[model samples]
Target: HMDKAYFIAKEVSTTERTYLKDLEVITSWFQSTVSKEDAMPEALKSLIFPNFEPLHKFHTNFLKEIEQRLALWEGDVMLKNIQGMKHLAAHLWKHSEALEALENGIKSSRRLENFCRDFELQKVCYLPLNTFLLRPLHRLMHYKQVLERLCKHHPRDCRAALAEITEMVAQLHGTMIKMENFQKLHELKKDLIGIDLVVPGREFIRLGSLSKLSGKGLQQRMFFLFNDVLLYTSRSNQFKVHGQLPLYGMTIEESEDPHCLTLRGQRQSIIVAASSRSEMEKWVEDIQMAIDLAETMVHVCWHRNTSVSMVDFSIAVENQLSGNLLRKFKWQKLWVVFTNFCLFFYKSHQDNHPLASLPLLGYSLTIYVFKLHFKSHVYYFRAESEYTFERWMEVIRSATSS
Candidate 1:
């Protein structure tokens, strides 16, 4: 009989490889670029690069050890391989400080932001530059998911490993909640102007387009949802905060139009139309739940039949990666946009309509030789090079698990 333990061990190896490549985005590529640029103060570089090097060194070795164990997985070897992650708890604590350092460094130097954007243009960094900073923190969730699977397959021995992992996850989750909040605020700073200090105990639930019924008919507005309030903005080059609605004493119901909803607030009421029925439900449901400060993840767990905490929401927001995917067999190209834990496919970046989409809730991402697959569908894709392939794998893994 084939060892089921072997399959779980193999998963560890695969995701380990993905994790290592993600580390290289900062440790190898970003570090080298910043070192070469004399304009970038060495002090800021010191704050960012040194913190990640230790983590990169530890995981690189862990990957090798796990790979070697998997190469010849006997009964005892698989269990030993599982123990490789036990040391991860120490590093998880260190990552909180590293996240703090990176954020501070970026704030000090405009050159740092430009450097990250330049690095992003390089095929390797498919996601935003700040996203990579949270990679180590997010990798813990992937480890948790893999170990959970191991526990299910072999309860007798995997219990100890799962117990250790669960403890580590809890510790990391506490640290990440604060860090994730800071990261979200940083991302929104550039996009949301005229808003001084948007950190109003505001948890970012969602941001998207909606058509508001104004005197000039339906005017497109960009809506931002927080725990306590919803701020709708104008659809200009700069998204100006047109109005704010307090969520307290607010109610949402489906409008006469299937794609629209009537948001009844204590002070004012407005009818807004989403792009689709599903989109409308998402806004309505989120608004209703968030009004009373209900846990959003509880609803996520109920709907997806998957356990999602605030940490998962943070990961999703931090790592929204998008780029083109070339499909084999059919040999067609797609301008893929990954957001809200789903992959939206466009004909091109210029195209307003999406041809189709694939929700990553129950999916898995893997690379073979060069092709990338999503579950049994075997949706083959090709990237520019090995670096690009690794980047795609990193982003897709986060999407699938988040």
Candidate 2:
């Protein structure tokens, strides 16, 4: 039994403690409007003028909220949780070769608009490579070499060798500087793309785009577009896999809610319907099974991408899936619930003196943002959930049970 009893309504709320009415209205307003594809650049200026300063303030404050919430709950003491973002980045970095290969393959094949496959390849290639494949192999080699060297000279700090090697090669961020040494590493060609970072030129291109997306408005849009799409597609797909349909006629607490839908091809009808029947046992199981499938992908993506040891990776992957199955698959569901609420707020404000829509180029950029965000979140979520988490969990759980 999980310590679910420990998690109560009052403890986990993100914005519950703040008492400032203007603060609530302003912040809520900011959350709603700017989260939209159309509203961000203007909403960003309105909510927090200047630029990234407001975003900095928002994340700092929001992080504090998360920590406070975490503090309120008691749990298994030794979860060894890694930072999700860092873990994700590390995971991606390790799979650079496979992912790059996938990209080149996709590009060469000219299978345009199928970023989903690229996204899925990135998902598949990351974990085993980073956490288990590359990491364990590197550690084994490092152990032998270091043991031999240390026997002769006995280096002072063991981390010195690691640092030295990683600075030149192992770490992804440092990859640019150490490109030349790997010219001889044709074996690495199995996974790696070019020898190193293409050039300094592409870095600026990425940075320029990153710079434009510096505000809370921009950030929210990015998260929703990238992350929220995963939730929507996965949730919707879940409805299809099961015999049930999404809510076509459910009423929210508020009547006349435009959010109302009856699965008639709208995106998230099933999840909405599932939410309405929280008390029914079969509905609860279906909802959770779907959510479990979604959360499994989250951990799958994380473990697949990180550079942990093989034993560690196997153990982590096993536990991640088990934890999801046992934990009721609530992570994605919770995220969907919160995002839906956030969207509702946005819809409420859609009629106001909203931001001016940008030109064709702006629209193109907006489309890019939309695609990237969903790619980051939704498409990736579905692929990983199905291929990695769902598959692995089924095997492990069945094997263990049998």
Candidate 3:
């Protein structure tokens, strides 16, 4: 509810233009304010701040990793510009401030100058794509930390304080990302579902939306992207809004060739049990029972046109139609294959099936059952102006429980 109103109601409009200039200006202002005092005030600073002997030592090492990741990502952008420079500048400014304070406040002033100068020089492009993308998030995180510290100092009215801070953060971020892309502005609508990326120690959130669809249709589409319980946006939002997005967060890189390795470790463990011989069999049996119950409860769903539940999936057996899974090979073909490897699995599976040919299964019926009863979504994307496009990858992700 909060995430919904924040993005749709506040950040986005009905337009479709990118706001490049707005992105740059706000990014610059954020970077300019990261002096030592300001830096320490960020929400997660307490976690990253150094004070005690071990705590300070761990902080030194941990910060290096954060710096490396930030720098590494700078080179990953398609377009780098002044906006990017501002982002890097802000990162360095704060780190410099902390180092200066730790090392007796700029005792080696020349060294600080050299580092800062090099950062500015290396920031070649003016767009600051990386900075703009990340700065608003950084500031929100700062605010969250400040909020927590205040709560500690004044516990009674934390709720009201939190509400006020969240509203400000929401408005500020909405303004930052609402800039026009070029000649026209591209607008996003507030789409707060049960999920949105959350930044720890931050007050606002990173809203996510699937503009191509809505309602139950939207939920179905989401099913594929989140192949497993772990893939749910809710979990990802935890780290993101908590300012821990980097820790156990998903990225575009993970989905690039996603035939294999798309399923996270948790989901993989379950699927692995399906064919394994060791203790995996125990897990397999358990999950198979779970899948069976899921199917049985699926029938109950049709009694009133409802959806499947976790408990339903946690309890049932491989019955007569169990062959449907193997028959369609939807599980093996799309979910787990790479180009060559997939071809190999397909050829091998087809060869082993009893009839020397695949069965003329009632695919449409099964799909309808899954969609309506289980509330699973399986539709493809079709545009008014062009041909239809199936969300194949999304299907693969969900089927494999990745």
lDDT of 2 by residue, 322-342 (tens): 111111111121111111001
What is the TM-score (0 to 1) of candidate 1?
0.70
Kindly report which residue stretches of model 3 are placed more than 4 angstroms away from their true locations once superposed: 1-128, 155-163, 171-402
TM-score of each: 0.70, 0.20, 0.18
Clashing pairs in model 1, backbone N/Cα/C closer than 3 A? none
* TM-score computed on alpha carbons, candidate 2: 0.20
User: lDDT of each structure?
Assistant: 0.63, 0.25, 0.25
Candidate 1 regions exceeding 4 Å error are: 1-3, 38-44, 74-91, 155-157, 236-241, 249-254, 257-259, 266-268, 276-278, 294-402
Question: Which is the better candidate, 1 or 2, if ranked by lDDT?
Answer: 1
Compare candidates 1 and 2 on TM-score and give the better one: 1
Model 3 TM-score, all chains together: 0.18
**Descending-TM-score candidate ranking:** 1, 2, 3
- Writing each residue's lDDT as its tens digit, candidate 1 over 1-402 gives 165556555545555555666678778777677668865666656566656777788777776777677675553443464466555556556666766666566666787777655766775564457667777777666666656766776645567656666777686788767767666656656566566644546676766666677777887666777777778776544456777888888778777854688888989888887666766766777788788774322223323433332445656644545555577653777666665566666677444345776666656565523443544665666754444455567667775742
lDDT of 3 by residue, 350-378 (tens): 12112222111111212411221123433
